[PDB]
A paper describes a structure:
D-cysteine (D-Cys) moieties are found in firefly luciferin, semisynthetic cephalosporin MT141 and malformin A. D-cysteine desulfhydrase (DCyD) is suggested to take part in the catabolic degradation of D-Cys and D-Cys-containing toxic compounds. The polypeptide fold of StDCyD is similar to those of other fold type II PLP-dependent enzymes and consists of a small domain (residues 48–161) and a large domain (residues 1–47 and 162–328). As in other PLP-dependent fold type II enzymes, the active site is situated in a large crevice between the two domains. StDCyD is specific for D-Cys and βCDA, and shows no activity with ACC, although it shares significant sequence identity with ACCDs.
In the form I structure, there are two dimers (AB and CD) and in form II structure, there are four dimers (AB, CD, EF and GH) in the asymmetric unit that are similar to the dimeric organization found in other fold type II PLP-dependent enzymes. Electron density map of unliganded StDCyD revealed a significant patch of density with tetrahedral geometry at the active site that could be interpreted as a sulphate (in form I crystal structure) or a phosphate (in form II crystal structure). These ions could be refined to reasonable B factors that were close to those of the surrounding atoms. Therefore, Form II structure has been utilized only for qualitative analysis.
Numbering used by the authors:
A (entry chain B): 6 to 328
B (entry chain A): -1 to 328
Write the structure that this text describes.
Amino acid sequence: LTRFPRLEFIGAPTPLEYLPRLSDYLGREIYIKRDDVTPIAMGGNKLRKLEFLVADALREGADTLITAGAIQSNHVRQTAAVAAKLGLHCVALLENPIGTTAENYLTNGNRLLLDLFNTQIEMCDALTDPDAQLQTLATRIEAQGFRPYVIPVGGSSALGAMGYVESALEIAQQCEEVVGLSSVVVASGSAGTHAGLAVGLEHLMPDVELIGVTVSRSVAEQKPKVIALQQAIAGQLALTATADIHLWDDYFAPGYGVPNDAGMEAVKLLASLEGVLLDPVYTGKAMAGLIDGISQKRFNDDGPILFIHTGGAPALFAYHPHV
Amino acid sequence: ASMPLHHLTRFPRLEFIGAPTPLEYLPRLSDYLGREIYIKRDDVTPIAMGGNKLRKLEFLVADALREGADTLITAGAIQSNHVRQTAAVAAKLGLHCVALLENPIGTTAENYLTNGNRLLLDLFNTQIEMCDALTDPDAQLQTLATRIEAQGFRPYVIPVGGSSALGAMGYVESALEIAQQCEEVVGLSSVVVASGSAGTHAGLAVGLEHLMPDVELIGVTVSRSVAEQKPKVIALQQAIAGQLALTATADIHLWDDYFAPGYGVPNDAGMEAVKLLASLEGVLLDPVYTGKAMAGLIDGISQKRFNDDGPILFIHTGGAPALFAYHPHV
């Protein structure tokens, strides 16, 4: 487990809850891991990552955090908050990945908060090669008088994903004597969350089937990225990881950041039926998957399914009327 | 010996909140303002983005269920935090939710009209009815209740902001957490909270008169003047104390200077507070309630308004979502 300094951003373990109404409607035991409920600026999965990341950034004596992502990036929002909380500067590199002109995407939702957090924001046409474009930026800042720290896209680095390894610890304990868990669903993006789970859950709950719903890439393009982190995480944790990574690509429809009916139906469903807010870019699509999953008997057995609510809610106000 | 409350447990409460919300020190802000400042994070709540209104609903909806109601009715501004939370609890529990909304600032700005809280209401499948003003809420709600009643349904009415004698029990019980958290940990001197539909302020004033009698409790009005507000708070204090089998003699304190043009209109002073807390501590306040309250807390220190120099606890009552509603302006 430990030798990696983590910061305390989350406090108590996030609640795990049963979703009786949804369960009864779908005809399956469904549980929810509430990682959206977090003290820091509306919270999210990204924070568990930043707990290790920023801890490290401080060891480096950095006075600035740099990172990149979509305009409505949950990661940037959380990063920028943590920054402000701690007194670090935050430079953010953003791309408009869907090529929209809609006011609310451009200024509202997450993006709006970044301004409140006094984030230094730079635009670019695309993040064709992030790690390089970030390093380009870092060094320019390194020059301007700032001692940075670079956080990868989505905070998905070997170290970052440590958050979700530790997450599995909570998850298994919470389920001890309390639930006979069969499957776990989580959105698979920048990969670190999925990966961290896969390492932790191989070692803590080896019988549990772990499904990732791709939000951007196909199984083809995604699987390698996940496996890479799995191995690296396992490497640094001094463990071995032999678990197969599972992924379903059918649910991200037009592509990253574009909303599908299938996913949007899942948002309306969970809000109306359970009073929980998903989001149109990540959790909604993941949930749409979970739903169609039961529909097509895709999971290993009939038993309990745990959905990892990774947050993202604020995006709702950004996506508001459309496009 | 958190005891004089004891009698304070004949009211069935639902469990929406779980663990006690975190109380935190605000080191950067403190150091900046030159005062020990603590924050009670009642915005951190599992239910649909959370808020103070939920601690109220914990008693209110519990009661609604005892009545066997299958519908909750309530009213407020378009961007009402209370309606959002009410409608959520509704959907979670499987009750219908009818909401009576007014546009209280007379704006035409898209984002106020459709975004922020109002947006979520649609996701929660809230039955929504518009009116020109809530000139007399209790009556306009009952008018609505009985029309629903006679379509063959079972409706429970929740006052504006959930501020009834019962509702405010949530914040009586909140006082318990607060004092328990500060035990040996902080020598608390003042508490600041927004004072609106009154229940939250009131509940605190009873609980804190009995649990921390030395603590000065300040309410920053967000809609009315000291003149018009004080009676409404005193009424709830007494009704609450009545039903809790206690006596309440504590003076209620109120500062009206900070709501500027009126309820739901943002002032510079208040927004300055939003930017300050976001940038300096990474906490999000809101432009209708918490911001203004905070603006008050700040100007308070500025004018030596509090009794002494000591620690101030700020009650973060939530409201954040309103930010995306108020977005570019008006």
